[PDB]
Design brief:
- It is classed as transcription.
- The structure is a homodimer of 257-residue chains.
- Helices cover 18% and strands 8% of the residues of chain A.
- Chain A is α+β, with helices and mostly antiparallel strands and 257 residues long.
- Chain A has two domains: 1-169, no CATH class; 170-255, no CATH class.
- In chain A, the strands form two sheets. In chain A, strands 2-1-4-3 form a four-stranded antiparallel β-sheet, with no helix packed on it. Chain A has a two-stranded antiparallel sheet with strand order 5-6.
- In chain A, helix 4 (180-189) packs across helix 5 (215-226).
- The longest helix of chain A has 12 residues, at 215-226.
- Chains A and B meet through loops of A and helix 2 of B.
Chain lengths: 257, 257
């Protein structure tokens, strides 16, 4: 069980991947292969992956998952030591944790595990064993279970730079290449409208400022072309409106200046 | 030495580094740990740099240093190596290599390692020795050290896709806020010029064509703070125009009509 306990956790390790990137799925082979409780915590205490394995009743886990957040001094003291710890509980070989908070280790043979998945430090991987101690073939996995999570913290937060950052730019790259009419079109079309969606006249809103009628069509022959929306435009009843892009609404409100 | 000589490889781990990747040095910190030849061959079958110390007899590992590329059948053959099988010279075990292509292992005990990463094949990292074999603890350094060769492949090509994407795009954005007139200026500016570095008069250049100077004032005061050109705006006498952007006026050539 040195080459077989690392070959069922692999049937779960994903690199970015298509199916939902979720920590509430990441410790599947860390409960019956490590056979130990798994906590996946990020830098300053913010919870994205939880779940105790065995019913151990402490007074900082009976009120902790109740908040979904590490409190006051659980943001400045869970991010200091360069490496792991051997056999943590009410006893500690040295000053493992501050004398103000010796209570995170009262219920379990706990093991705070460092995530090093890119040449850095990604929060914590807090374990808490019932009776059995951490020895040989269930310690390397408690460490390996931190980087089976560490190909996904920069894959549930690095989808926050590829999709979230881009969507701003395109929703500007299309707006940039608009002449004044079409730029006054889409600004009056989506302000005098049903917040989210819309459906009204084809060109009765057109020349009530001074603009023309058919320049309204090509204004939409921009968004549809750059790549923002879908609209089954009827030549018999105005037109159809429903957004596709997720970040266009905000960059439409804050434009009154 | 399975965690002390690994801080000569995990500490070599320079994520993107910060300097335009050098590829022989990346093949030198695998030479001061396992102690062997290094051949960082990528996916298409090309070569980038080599750290060889001892003189070993070889046949097509020396037409791979001259050409830097394999002819005909190797790109097909070494495309079919899944993981890390240990020690294959003139004698393997199954149908791993053709007999006509078997001359890649003749002399010495060479152990080929694939560079798997991100969920795809990136190439073969070739290591060859003379009279020492890759033992029970000499090759997981080429397994954990094949997870990160692709790092500076998804950081070097990743600073030649975002680096290129941004270019051709910024090269276009500026083009946009240039009204047809303001464009006409650019079409005349670079066409009558010597080399990349060119400069001539303020009053003349304009109505020589017919255009005003006023729409070169603001026209070249767009690409200025946009991010395309630097030019010391001497209102006393014209100005000198050098580009901040490379493949930019190459977008001016093909877009004639």
């Amino acid at each position: 069980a040195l080459l077989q306990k690392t070959r069922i956790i692999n049937s779960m390790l994903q690199a970015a991947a298509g199916k939902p990137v979720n920590f509430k799925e990441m410790a599947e082979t860390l409960r019956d292969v490590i056979d130990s409780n798994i906590f996946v915590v990020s830098r300053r205490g913010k919870l994205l992956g939880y779940s105790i394995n065995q019913q151990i009743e402490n007074d900082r886990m009976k009120k902790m998952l109740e908040d979904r957040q590490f409190p006051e001094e659980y943001t400045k003291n869970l991010f200091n030591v360069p490496e792991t710890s051997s056999n943590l509980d009410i006893n500690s070989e040295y000053t493992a944790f501050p004398v103000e908070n010796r209570d995170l280790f009262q219920a379990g043979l706990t093991t705070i595990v460092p995530i090093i998945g890119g040449g850095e430090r990604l929060g914590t991987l807090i374990l808490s064993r019932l009776q059995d101690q951490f020895n040989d073939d269930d310690l390397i996995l408690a460490e390996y279970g931190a980087t089976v999570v560490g190909m996904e913290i920069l894959r549930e937060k690095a989808e926050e730079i590829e999709e979230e950052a881009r969507s701003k730019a395109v929703v500007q790259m299309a707006i940039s290449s608009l002449s004044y009419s079409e730029l006054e079109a889409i600004e009056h079309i989506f302000e005098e409208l049903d917040g989210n969606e819309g459906l009204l006249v084809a060109s009765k809103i057109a020349d009530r400022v001074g603009i023309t009628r058919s320049v309204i069509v090509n204004a939409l022959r921009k968004l549809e072309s750059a790549g923002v929306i879908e609209s089954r435009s009827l030549g018999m009843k105005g037109t159809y409106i429903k957004v596709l892009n997720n970040k266009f609404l905000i960059e439409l409100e804050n434009l009154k200046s």
